[PDB]
Every structure is written in C-alpha cells, then in structure tokens.
Design a protein around this ligand. Sequence first.
Ligand SMILES: *[C@@H]1O[C@H](CO)[C@@H](O[C@@H]2O[C@H](CO)[C@@H](O[C@@H]3O[C@H](CO)[C@@H](O)[C@H](O)[C@@H]3O)[C@H](O)[C@H]2NC(C)=O)[C@H](O)[C@H]1NC(C)=O
Ligand SMILES: *[C@@H]1O[C@H](CO[C@@H]2O[C@@H](C)[C@@H](O)[C@@H](O)[C@@H]2O)[C@@H](O[C@@H]2O[C@H](CO)[C@@H](O)[C@H](O)[C@H]2NC(C)=O)[C@H](O)[C@H]1NC(C)=O
Ligand SMILES: *[C@@H]1O[C@H](CO)[C@@H](O[C@@H]2O[C@H](CO)[C@@H](O)[C@H](O)[C@H]2NC(C)=O)[C@H](O)[C@H]1NC(C)=O
Ligand SMILES: *[C@@H]1O[C@H](CO)[C@@H](O[C@@H]2O[C@H](CO)[C@@H](O)[C@H](O)[C@H]2NC(C)=O)[C@H](O)[C@H]1NC(C)=O
Ligand code: NAG
Ligand code: NAG
Ligand code: NAG
Ligand code: NAG
Length: 744
Amino acid sequence: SQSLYREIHQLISFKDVLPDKNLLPDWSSNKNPCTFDGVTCRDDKVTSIDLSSKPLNVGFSAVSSSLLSLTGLESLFLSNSHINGSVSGFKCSASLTSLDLSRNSLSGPVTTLTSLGSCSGLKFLNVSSNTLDFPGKVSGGLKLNSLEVLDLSANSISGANVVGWVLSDGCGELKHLAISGNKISGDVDVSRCVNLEFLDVSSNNFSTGIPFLGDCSALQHLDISGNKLSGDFSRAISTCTELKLLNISSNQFVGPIPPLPLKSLQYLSLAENKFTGEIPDFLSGACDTLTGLDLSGNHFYGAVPPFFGSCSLLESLALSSNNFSGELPMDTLLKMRGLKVLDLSFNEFSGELPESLTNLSASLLTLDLSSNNFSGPILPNLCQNPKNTLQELYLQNNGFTGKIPPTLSNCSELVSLHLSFNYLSGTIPSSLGSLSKLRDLKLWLNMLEGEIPQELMYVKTLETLILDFNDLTGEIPSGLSNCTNLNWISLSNNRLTGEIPKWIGRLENLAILKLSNNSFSGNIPAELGDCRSLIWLDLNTNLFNGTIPAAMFKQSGKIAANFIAGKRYVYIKNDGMKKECHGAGNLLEFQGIRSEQLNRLSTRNPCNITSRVYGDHTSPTFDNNGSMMFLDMSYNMLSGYIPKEIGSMPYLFILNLGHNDISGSIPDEVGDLRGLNILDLSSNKLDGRIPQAMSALTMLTEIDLSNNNLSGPIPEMGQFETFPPAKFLNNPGLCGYPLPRCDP
Ligand SMILES: *[C@@H]1O[C@H](CO)[C@@H](O[C@@H]2O[C@H](CO)[C@@H](O[C@@H]3O[C@H](CO)[C@@H](O)[C@H](O)[C@@H]3O)[C@H](O)[C@H]2NC(C)=O)[C@H](O)[C@H]1NC(C)=O
Ligand SMILES: *[C@@H]1O[C@H](CO[C@@H]2O[C@@H](C)[C@@H](O)[C@@H](O)[C@@H]2O)[C@@H](O[C@@H]2O[C@H](CO)[C@@H](O)[C@H](O)[C@H]2NC(C)=O)[C@H](O)[C@H]1NC(C)=O
Ligand SMILES: *[C@@H]1O[C@H](CO)[C@@H](O[C@@H]2O[C@H](CO)[C@@H](O)[C@H](O)[C@H]2NC(C)=O)[C@H](O)[C@H]1NC(C)=O
Ligand SMILES: *[C@@H]1O[C@H](CO)[C@@H](O[C@@H]2O[C@H](CO)[C@@H](O)[C@H](O)[C@H]2NC(C)=O)[C@H](O)[C@H]1NC(C)=O
Ligand SMILES: *[C@@H]1O[C@H](CO)[C@@H](O)[C@H](O)[C@H]1NC(C)=O
Ligand SMILES: *[C@@H]1O[C@H](CO)[C@@H](O)[C@H](O)[C@H]1NC(C)=O
Ligand SMILES: *[C@@H]1O[C@H](CO)[C@@H](O)[C@H](O)[C@H]1NC(C)=O
Ligand SMILES: *[C@@H]1O[C@H](CO)[C@@H](O)[C@H](O)[C@H]1NC(C)=O
C-alpha cells in the first residue's frame, strides 16, 4: 500500500535533516523499516520509535512533520534527544498513545502543548526537563482532557493557579499528575479528578492552601514537599483511605504529628518541618504496611516508642536532627526484621552501646549514630555474626573511648567507616586492610597513636583517608601507592615524618592532599605535577626544603576535576593575629558532625575557634580546562626562586608561600593569576621590584609581602593602595603609598 511507501520515505527524510548522518547508519531507503535500530514493528508495520539518548540536534518541526504523522505509530520515545524549538499545530496520527519528549530543550509558553490535542488517542505525555514557561496571566486551559499521565516537571513554569489551568477542561481520565520543580503557586483543586492516583506538586512555590483532594478516592501517592506550606494537612487527607505514600517534607508545618490515614500507608515523610512533641502511639496502625519513615529535621524528643516492634515491614527509619534521648532501644529494633537503614544522627542518644547491636550487623546496610552523646567503647563483638551485610557505619562526633576494634574487619561489605570526633586511643588496626570494598576511612580528631598501617595497601577501593588531628607517627607507608583510586588524603596535625614519596604522582585521581603540621622533610617532589586531578595542596608547617620545582604546575590548563563533588566539608579560615596559628585555612571533612562541636579542636589547634568557618558541600567550579585552586607551602625551609610557571594557574584562589627562605624576585607571571584572592609571600628573602603586571590582578582580598628585601615603588595601579602599610613592612628599599613617598 501507499502507507508502506510513505513510512520509509518519511523516516529517511528525517534522517536526512539530522546534522550528524552517523546516528542512524542502518536506516536507508529501499530497505524495510522493521529491520532498523530504534524501530519496533508488529506484523511488518511500524508501531513504535525510540531515538532516546541520541544527539539528534533537530527542531520539533522535524519530529512532527516526519515521525508523529506516521500511520499506526503508537508510541514515540525521544527522551534526551537534543530536540529544541516549540510545539505548534501538526497532523498527528490517531493511534499515538504515548509521547516522551523529556530532557530536551523545548521552549516557549506551556500553552504550546495544547496543540498536541491533534493526537486524539494521546494518553501519556512526558515533557519534563524542558525550558517551557508561563508568561503573564493564567487564562484558558491545557485542553488535553484525554490524558491519563502528564509530567510537566522540571520546567521554567512560573505562575499562580497553573494547576487549575492544566485541569480546566476536565480531569476524569487523569491518573498521574506530576508538576514538580517549577515555580507554581496558588490553589491546587483535584476534587473533580476522581481517578487520580499520583499527585506530585513538590519543589514549587506553594505558600497558601493545602491541595484540596475531595473524596480522594483513588489517591495512592501525594507529594507536596519542598514548598512553604502550613496548616491542617491532616484534615485535607483524612478521606484518603487508599494513600500509600505521603511526603510533606521541606515545608512550614507546625505542632505535633496529627492523625493520619494509616491502613495502607507505606512511605511517610514529615521531615524538615517545624514539628514538635513525642512520636505518638497511634502510628502503630501503619505497621502492617509501613516500609519507610522519615521524621528528620524537626523538634521531636523522648524515646522511639515500643510499637515499632510490630512495624516488621519497615526498611528505613530516619529520626535525624531532632532531640531524641535515652539509651539505644534495642528491644524494639531487634524485632524490626525488615530494617536496612537506621539513621539516628544529630540527636542526644546516650550511654554505652548495648551488646545486642551485634545482631543488627547481619540485617542493616546503614547504621548512623553520628553526633550523639554516646560513651564507652566501640563494641568489639560487632560483625561477630557471619554474613554481615553492613555497608555504612557512622559513629562520628560521640564520646567514644578505647581502641578501634580490629574485629571491625569482619564487616566485609563495609564501604564507609566514619569514627571521627571521638576520644579513641591506640592504633589503627592492620586488619582494616581486609575491608576490600572500603572507600572512606575517616578517623580524624581522635588520639590514635602508632604508624599508619602498611596493610592498607590491600584496600584497592580506598577513595578517602582522613586521619587529621591524631597522635600518629612514622613515615607515610609505601603501601598507599597501591591505592590508586585515592582522591582525598588528609594527614594533618600528627607527628608524621619522612618525605612526600615520589610515587604520589602515580595517584591520578588525587584531588586534595593535606599534610600540614607534621615533621615531613626533604624536597617537594616534582612528581606532584604528574597528579592530573590535584586542586588543593596544603603542606604548611613542616620541615620541607630545597627549591620549589617548576614541574609541579605542569597540569595547569589540563585538569578535569568533577569526581570529588557531593562530599560535605568545612573550611576554617585563619585571621592574621595569632602567630602560633599557621596556614591560610584548614579544609576539613564534615559529614555528620555538628559545627558546635568544632570547639573540640581548641585543645589541639592554636587557630582561634571558628573565626571564619565555611561549610559548603565541596564542588569545583570549572569544566574542560582547570588548574590548581589552593597552594599553601608556608612555614617550611624552602629555598631558591619561585618559578615563572607559578603564574600558569588561572583557577588559583589562594597562594601562601610565607615563612620560607625563598630568594630572587617575584616573577612577572604572578599578574596572570586572574582568579587570585590571597597572596602571602611574607617572611622570605625576596628582592627587586614588585612587578607592575600585578596591577592587572583585580580580585585580591588579602596580600602580604612583608619581611623581605623588596625595593622600588609599590605599583600605584590595581589593588595595592587598598592594602594597609603592614602588608609591605620590613622592606627597607620599598616605598610608595601605602608606605612613605619614594624620594630619590
Ligand atoms: C600543631 O599541633 C600541635 C599539637 O597538637 C599544637 O600544639 C598544641 O596546641 C594546643 C592549643 O594551643 C595546646 O592546647 C593547650 O593545652 C593547654 C594545657 O596543656 C591548655 O591550657 C591551653 O588552653 C590549650 O588548650 C596543646 O598543649 C599543644 N600541644 C603540644 C604537644 O604542644 C600546635 O599548636 C599546632 N600548630 C599549628 C601550627 O597548628
Ligand atoms: C634538606 O634536608 C635533608 C634532610 O635533613 C634534614 O636536615 C638535616 C640538617 C638534619 O636536621 C636532618 O635531621 C633533617 O631531616 C638533607 O638531607 C641530608 O642533609 C645532610 C646535611 O645535614 C647532607 O650531608 C646529606 O647528604 C643530605 N642527604 C641525605 C642523603 O639525607 C638535605 O641536604 C637538605 N637539602 C637542602 C637543599 O638543604
Ligand atoms: C536549536 O539548536 C540548534 C543547535 O545548535 C540550533 O542550530 C544552530 O545554532 C547556531 C547557534 O549559534 C546557529 O548559528 C545555526 O545557524 C543553527 N543552525 C540551524 C540549522 O538552525 C537552532 O538555532 C536552535 N533552534 C532554536 C529555535 O532555538
Ligand atoms: C520526599 O521529599 C523530599 C523533599 O522534596 C525528597 O528529597 C529530595 O529529592 C529530590 C529529587 O526529586 C532532590 O533534588 C532534593 O535535593 C531532595 N531534598 C532533600 C531535602 O533531601 C525525597 O526524596 C522524597 N522521598 C520520597 C521517597 O519520595
Ligand atoms: C513565589 O510566590 C510569591 C507569592 O506569589 C512571590 O512574591 C515570589 O516572587 C515567588 N518566588 C519565586 C522564587 O518565584
Ligand atoms: C534534649 O533532651 C535532653 C535530655 O532529656 C534535655 O536535657 C535537653 O534540654 C533537650 N534539648 C532541647 C533543645 O530542648
Ligand atoms: C602493590 O604494588 C606493587 C608494585 O606495583 C605490586 O607488585 C604488588 O603486588 C602490589 N601489592 C598489592 C597487595 O596489591
Ligand atoms: C574554561 O571552560 C569553561 C567551559 O564551561 C568556560 O566557562 C571558561 O570560560 C573557561 N575558563 C576561563 C577562565 O575562561
């Protein structure tokens, strides 16, 4: 027939408009479309097309003209296909039921989608993750009353009462309405939508009424999270007898936990709200069905009540960031057969760990008891049971004493071990080398003595080793060369010795290296320049010597460094007041630790308290090009000259080379450091003129050139007049404002 002849010519005309011909190489003319990649056929007729995740780079007009008009096309999946432009009127086939145009660059007002009404059989529509918007006053309607599923999420839709617009010409067929990640406000009325099962209006701008649900006859999923909502949500959902998931998290709800529909409830989040009081006993009605609970980030208190024993289907229990107290309720927890994640972090649970915690090692994937007032030892009998399924053990920021148990090596599935901010003595057990799946070993601010275990070489998966603020001794073990995936090594404030080993260059994923306040010696290895991800090098307060090698900056302009983002951190900035406090600032790991317990550092660290504290979840700025961001090598015995390659790092914020024996002049290339905020070159033997090229630097917030033998006039252009005299003092030959006038 003509429809076969039409089908092949339409498909091939689509191929021909594509900028890249190679995307559909098997598509060709005079060949059966049912043999093509992307095509589904039933009885030798095209029924579905799937060109998802292929960079087609074509407008919607090409899709509508060629593909959506094909006779008998039932579904068209073009998610992440690099389609742009706008929807408008076209001839749509009557058989088309599903259309996925998610994750594209579609633009224009959201009223453009009304022209999809041509598709008389359209039931499923996904235009999420596009750039659609709603300019001005909201009037008319979407007029796609035949849809069972509509996903308009993660657009640029900004407006009041956009939900009434979607639902204006009826919603009797609508089963799933998702419109999250927009800036929608106003009223949400879904009372006429009597078959609605799924409602997601989350991450929006609703600060008014709770959505009115009517009889709520079919509603199983209700997500109103990430808004500014308050008021009587209890009354609004009380008729919702079928409700399985209720996520009201990240809102302004207050008071105690009110009555809920419990009989079918599986997931409940009241997290990040302003809720108060104790967990009421009426939540026992959820225990036949409750799979997940989240009461994190509220002002709850008391104990976990004993009804949770009956909640035997409960997989995750998150009671984080509240004021829960008492001993660890093991009689309740051991009865929860289903429990896989236990998150009791940022509370005031107290006493020693009960012996019966050993039993939950074989069932839990995650145990988080961080930031609590737990005392006594870590249980040596943990992971005594065979088949220990435990992946994450977070015990940081407690009052734990004694040794790190070697028997922790029996948790063979363990990916993260965080035992920081405790009072732990003894050695880091050699048996932790056995943890063959371990990525994160964080033991900082304890009293750990001994050497760093050579046997850590057997941990092939090790990504972070955070051992700051301990009483550690010996050299860096050569075994750490074997751990090739290391991206964050931090051994500061110990009594470690030896050289930075030359094999450090073999660590290709290494981003952050912090070795400050130790007795490390010898030359700075040129092999640090072989590290193709290194953005943060802090070596301050050590006994390093020799010349700064030119070769360490060879990666400048070549670094791609976007593996380390997602990890929480803290940057405690130094202020130039205390002579005992050294360095620009301590970048430190900070997952699951309260900033209020940073006062614990005071007895180990001379640097003030938290003069400038930044807690901001990591995350490097650049993409394709890249360079080192932070370079502190202060308070060592470094000699020779600063090489001219020091100015080859455009992303360098901080450069502290202070308190060394560095001679020659300040290279002119320093003016190329366009991203530089801080430049400490003080207490060296630098001589000659401050180069005029440094006047091009526009972003210096701090500078220090004092205690050198610099001469001539201070540059009058740029930022030098901003800085006080003290930053240029003890430079006998140096003159010009802020210092006195240069007289010949
Ligand atoms: C490098 O690390 C060493 C050792 O941690 C630091 O020395 C320590 O500095 C702290 C804070 O100044 C001292 O704590 C003090 O303890 C006394 C009582 O002993 C107390 O009265 C003070 O109020 C303060 O809490 C600690 O004694 C001291 N330890 C040693 C072994 O000297 C040093 O300051 C750090 N250096 C840098 C550059 O950060
Ligand atoms: C840089 O330092 C190293 C290591 O020695 C440090 O300084 C010494 C004076 C002493 O205090 C050690 O305990 C320190 O660890 C120097 O290495 C040796 O230094 C000696 C002189 O003391 C010299 O005779 C050796 O040949 C050097 N070599 C060995 C093989 O250790 C190194 O010379 C210093 N470099 C510079 C440029 O000063
Ligand atoms: C849709 O995106 C494509 C992909 O770049 C755009 O096509 C080219 O864009 C560059 C941008 O500088 C133009 O100079 C070319 O002339 C464009 N080529 C063609 C064939 O159009 C396209 O302009 C985008 N369309 C819309 C409506 O934004
Ligand atoms: C309950 O709602 C919260 C808050 O909206 C969800 O957590 C967010 O998940 C989105 C992805 O859709 C992220 O972009 C946000 O960063 C998360 N926010 C927070 C505060 O964590 C959470 O996933 C929901 N839970 C369920 C089971 O649906
Ligand atoms: C959210 O809505 C309020 C009230 O209509 C409005 O003033 C505000 O600009 C909106 N915020 C955003 C982020 O769109
Ligand atoms: C948290 O609970 C403890 C222990 O009962 C109590 O002493 C403390 O005052 C509570 N915290 C707050 C902020 O109310
Ligand atoms: C560590 O690396 C060395 C040198 O590449 C290799 O011969 C040795 O077998 C490795 N050891 C382990 C335990 O992986
Ligand atoms: C590096 O490349 C990125 C690509 O996103 C670009 O934004 C930036 O302009 C380049 N760096 C600088 C300093 O210009």
